[PDB]
Amino acid sequence: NSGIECDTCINPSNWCDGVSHCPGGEDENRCVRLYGPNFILQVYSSQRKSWHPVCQDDWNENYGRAACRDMGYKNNFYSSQGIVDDSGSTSFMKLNTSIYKKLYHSDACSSKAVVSLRCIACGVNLND
Amino acid sequence: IVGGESALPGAWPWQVSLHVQNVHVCGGSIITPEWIVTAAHCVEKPLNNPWHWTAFAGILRQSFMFYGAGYQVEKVISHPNYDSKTKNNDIALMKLQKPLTFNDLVKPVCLPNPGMMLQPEQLCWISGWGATEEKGKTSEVLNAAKVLLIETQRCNSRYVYDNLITPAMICAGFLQGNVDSCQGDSGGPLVTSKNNIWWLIGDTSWGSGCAKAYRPGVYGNVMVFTDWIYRQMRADGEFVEH
Numbered sequence: 437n438s439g440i441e442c443d444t445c446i447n448p449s450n451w452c453d454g455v456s457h458c459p460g461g462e463d464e465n466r467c468v469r470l471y472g473p474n475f476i477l478q479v480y481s482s483q484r485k486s487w488h489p490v491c492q493d494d495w496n497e498n499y500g501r502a503a504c505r506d507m508g509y510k511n512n513f514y515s516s517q518g519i520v521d522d523s524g525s526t527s528f529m530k531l532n533t534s535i536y537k538k539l540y541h542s543d544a545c546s547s548k549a550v551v552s553l554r555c556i557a558c559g560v561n562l563n564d
Numbered sequence: 565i566v567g568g569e570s571a572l573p574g575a576w577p578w579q580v581s582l583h584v585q586n587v588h589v590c591g592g593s594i595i596t597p598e599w600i601v602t603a604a605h606c607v608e609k610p611l612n613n614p615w616h617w618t619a620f621a622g623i624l625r626q627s628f629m630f631y632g633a634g635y636q637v638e639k640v641i642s643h644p645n646y647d648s649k650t651k652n653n654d655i656a657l658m659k660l661q662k663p664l665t666f667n668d669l670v671k672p673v674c675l676p677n678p679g680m681m682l683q684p685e686q687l688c689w690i691s692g693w694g695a696t697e698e699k700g701k702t703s704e705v706l707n708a709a710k711v712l713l714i715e716t717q718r719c720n721s722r723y724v725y726d727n728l729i730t731p732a733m734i735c736a737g738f739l740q741g742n743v744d745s746c747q748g749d750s751g752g753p754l755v756t757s758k759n760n761i762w763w764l765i766g767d768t769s770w771g772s773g774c775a776k777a778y779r780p781g782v783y784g785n786v787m788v789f790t791d792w793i794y795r796q797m798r799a800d801g802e803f804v805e806h
């Protein structure tokens with residue numbers, strides 16, 4: 437309750453920084469998240485201490501499969517398309533082709549779209 | 565499920581009957597081909613070991629859950645901070661040895677994502693083979709009922725549950741009663757529709773009586789537990805990767 441807890445407390449700049457600092461690795465295993473009813477792909481920024489939408493720029497399905505792998509869905513992958521961001525976000529995570537830690541902070545997305553990653557075909561019943 | 569209706573094939577393709585000793589004990593929500601969200605009170609000792617548990621998916625009727633249609637549970641994971649007494653963090657995870665074959669009768673529910681912006685009184689649905697009346701017996705047919713979310717501030721009123729609803733708990737149903745979850749819906753889905761997607765908003769945890777006025781259903785807040793769920797699923801994927 438001064439920084440980020442591991443259930444050990446961590447400085448939020450060491451949360452999601454690529455180096456596993458909690459003994460249970462809690463600081464490095466929950467760094468990718470889907471946001472909102474549109475599955476806006478988000479990555480936690482250690483520097484900005486915030487969750488940020490991944491830009492659709494140069495994002496392919498293997499990066500989604502990897503984010504899906506990093507979220508516990510393993511080889512489950514359903515959809516990764518670009519969508520307008522409804523997460524109310526101002527900073528975004530763009531890919532430096534040269535999951536998390538493979539992105540960098542940008543305030544725009546050249547595609548104008550964020551990644552909507554659907555790791556599993558779920559949430560559908562008999563009635564649309 | 566009190567106040568509800570017989571569920572149709574494929575209406576709740578995530579709903580699973582979890583069995584111990586050839587009888588339904590709890591419900592579950594398929595979130596992945598091998599992972600099932602249930603309640604932690606369901607798998608309290610002595611049912612903490614996966615061997616007691618068999619899962620039945622896509623079968624609406626308990627009598628149609630035959631020897632050979634069950635999916636043996638391989639791993640039971642109770643929430644680490646589950647309290648048997650307050651029933652805070654009443655969420656558990658059941659892995660299946662055999663992955664479930666997804667169809668229109670068996671399908672996963674979507675784990676809730678941060679920022680669902682759900683309504684304070686969001687129309688949700690509760691399914692299960694639990695009692696159709698309080699103190700009643702396990703239902704034969706899978707039942708489901710429309711329930712509305714009750715904001716925790718309203719549910720923590722002295723006239724409802726008196727500060728017993730933790731942040732890891734969400735309330736759903738009707739303050740008038742009549743429509744609630746009951747014995748045997750435990751661990752079952754509290755699911756809502758949003759963006760033409762069904763979202764596992766809660767797992768059936770507890771409540772005083774069934775369908776009693778000012779005594780609604782209390783569900784484990786799956787949103788609060790998503791990180792734990794993602795961590796436990798990823799760790800299993802890493803461990804069996806070898």
Ligand SMILES: CC(C)(NS(=O)(=O)c1ccc2c(Cl)cnc(NC(=N)N)c2c1)C(=O)O
Nearest residue numbers: 744745746747750770771772773774780781
């Ligand atoms: C007080 C007591 C012990 N309740 S209960 O009947 O045994 C019972 C058991 C399980 C429930 C579940 Cl899993 C979910 N929800 C419930 N309640 C609700 N209002 N939705 C439940 C209620 C009684 O017998 O008076």
Ligand SMILES: *[C@@H]1O[C@H](CO)[C@@H](O)[C@H](O)[C@H]1NC(C)=O
Nearest residue numbers: 531532533534539540541542
């Ligand atoms: C991409 O990485 C390399 C150095 O690792 C460098 O070209 C640049 O600093 C990075 N991209 C941006 C714009 O951050």
Ligand SMILES: [Ca+2]
Nearest residue numbers: 450455457463
């Ligand atoms: Ca770290």
